[PDB]
Amino acid sequence: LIPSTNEEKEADAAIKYLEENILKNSKFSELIREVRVIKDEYALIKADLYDVIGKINNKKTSLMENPKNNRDKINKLTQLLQNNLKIDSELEQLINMIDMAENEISSAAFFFDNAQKRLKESIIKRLESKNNRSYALKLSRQALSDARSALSNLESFASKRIEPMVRKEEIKELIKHAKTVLESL
Amino acid sequence: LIPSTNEEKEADAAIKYLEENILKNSKFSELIREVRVIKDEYALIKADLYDVIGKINNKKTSLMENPKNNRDKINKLTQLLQNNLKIDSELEQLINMIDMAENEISSAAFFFDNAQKRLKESIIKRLESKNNRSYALKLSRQALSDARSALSNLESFASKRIEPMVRKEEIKELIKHAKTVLESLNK
């Protein structure tokens, strides 16, 4: 199970290095909670901005059915509204930033996870080639052994048919000598 | 597909030794047939013997119910019967040598075909072990790569921590101010 090859060690070393001073200073669950707190905090800030923008617009609209008398008011309000669209715009960027961040840390846990799996899978395949190469050799030796048992069988066959091949006609005549002695008596 | 290792080579040579010197472009089946031909020849011969045993066991009981002095001309026929029964044995032996012969050539064929398959299996298995090793390397590299991806995100994440913790109070305050401006108009 231990990693052996230079590459297996090189991965193991990288994984254990994340594990034993990064993910033991600051673990994944507690990094995810970290961000989700501020993500929530920024959503309340958005909510509040949207509330005041709406109040700005609703006041401006009302004042606008009397725009001569409300010119100043309408101007402060127009300007004020335009300022908050800018605030909204910079807030969006930050909310984007915190979204990426939340993804990045969920990528990390993903990648880290997969990495551990990918190394387990590599060591297991190493052992599969080791077993396969070992079985090759043994196949090559069994093959040699079969060829020898084949040889030893072929020699046994060779020598067992000699007597029978050699005494056949000696026996054919030994019969059919004594046939003609049945003929005549 | 060609024998490379010393042990693949050594099995190659033991198979080809039989092909070249013992077998010589005459299948196992040919050797079987030749054994079968002589078992049939002996089959026939044992019939013939059995057949003229019967015929002695007549002219020894037949032509022996009118026998001009039975005791003497008995021996000659029992001598043959006995002289042609011991053979009936030597014959059974030879028939058995031929069956043992036929069984040997059966086992030869089994081991021979197995030598060939075992040898093909080993070459194939050897190549399989190297592909498995290629895949083990690819898998072990992808592990490093994944470990470095994970790093990249943890670095990237870490460099987004501070901008928002700083900027956020200032935004809270710009917001406080906006609603201050708006209340004030309403006076």
Author numbering:
A (entry chain A): 5 to 189
B (entry chain B): 5 to 191
What is the paper's account of this structure, in its own sentences?
We determined the crystal structure of a previously uncharacterized B. burgdorferi outer surface protein BBK01, known to belong to the paralogous gene family 12 (PFam12) as one of its five members. In a recent article studying the antigenicity and immunogenicity of PFam12 members, it was suggested to rename the proteins as family twelve lipoproteins (Ftl) FtlA (BBK01), FtlB (BBG01), FtlC (BBH37), and FtlD (BBJ08). Structural analysis of BBK01 revealed similarity to the coiled coil domain of structural maintenance of chromosomes (SMC) protein family members, while functional studies indicated that all PFam12 members are non-specific DNA-binding proteins. In the current study we focused on the paralogous gene family 12 (PFam12), which contains five members (BB0844, BBG01, BBH37, BBJ08, and BBK01) that do not demonstrate meaningful sequence identity with proteins from any other organism which would allow us to judge the functions of these proteins. It is known that PFam12 members are surface-exposed and highly immunogenic lipoproteins that are upregulated as the tick starts the blood meal.
The protein crystals of FtlA diffracted to 2.7 Å resolution, and the crystal structure was determined by a single-wavelength anomalous diffraction (SAD) technique. The space group was C2 with two protomers per asymmetric unit. However, in the crystal structure of FtlA, only residues 110–297 were built in the final model, as electron density was not observed for N-terminal residues 28–109. The assumption that approximately the first 80 N-terminal residues in FtlA are disordered was approved by the AlphaFold predicted model; therefore, the flexible nature of the N-terminal residues can explain their absence in the crystal structure of FtlA. The overall monomer structure of FtlA consists of two comparatively short α-helices, αA and αB, and a 120 residue long helix αC, which are connected by short loop regions. In the protein crystal, FtlA forms a homodimer where the αC from one of the monomers interacts with the same α-helix in the other monomer by forming an antiparallel coiled coil structure of approximately 180 Ǻ in length. As the dimer interface is made by residues found on all three α-helices by interacting with the equivalent residues on the other monomer, the homodimer forms a massive 7950 Ǻ2 buried surface area as detected from PISA assembly analysis and involves more than 50 residues. As judged from the crystal structure of FtlA and taking into account the conserved residues of the PFam12 members, the potential DNA-binding site in the PFam12 proteins might be located in the middle of the dimer, along residues Arg242, Arg235, and Lys118 or the distal ends of the dimer where conserved residues Lys281 and Lys182 are located. This assumption is supported by the electrostatic surface potential map, which shows a distinctive positive charge at the middle segment of FtlA and at both ends of the dimer.
